[PDB]
């Protein structure tokens, strides 16, 4: 197997913003470890000339989610959002960084 190209570990929100504004495609994303909330993960995605940040939520049963659909791992949440918008008002489908 190959490592995932979307995990960046603990990088500043600003650095994620910086590198993502330079991407050419909508949906370009990365998962980072939140510096504001230790133990939390954040999804940073580019759409248009904008860069948005989503907090990966975890519920009482230990599952991950953004809005309503729950998953068992960050892997599945990410893969599911490659064909389901990550936002309720814009159609942002995750696409690997390039």
């Amino acid at each position: 197997m190959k490592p995932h190209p979307w995990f960046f570990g603990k990088i500043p929100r600003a650095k994620a913003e910086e590198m993502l504004s330079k991407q050419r495609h909508d949906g370009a994303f990365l998962i980072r470890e939140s510096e504001s909330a230790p133990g939390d993960f954040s999804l940073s995605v580019k759409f248009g000339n904008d860069v948005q940040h989503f907090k990966v939520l975890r519920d009482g049963a230990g599952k991950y989610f953004l809005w309503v659909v729950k998953f068992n791992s960050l892997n599945e949440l990410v893969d599911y959002h490659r064909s389901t918008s990550v936002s309720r008002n814009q159609q942002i489908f995750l696409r690997d960084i390039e």
């Binding site: 929100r13 940040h53 989503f54 939520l57 953004l66 809005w67 936002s87």
Partner: peptide
């Protein structure tokens, strides 16, 4: 504080 589209 930092803000998130889903929070």
């Amino acid at each position: 504080k930092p803000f998130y589209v889903n929070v």
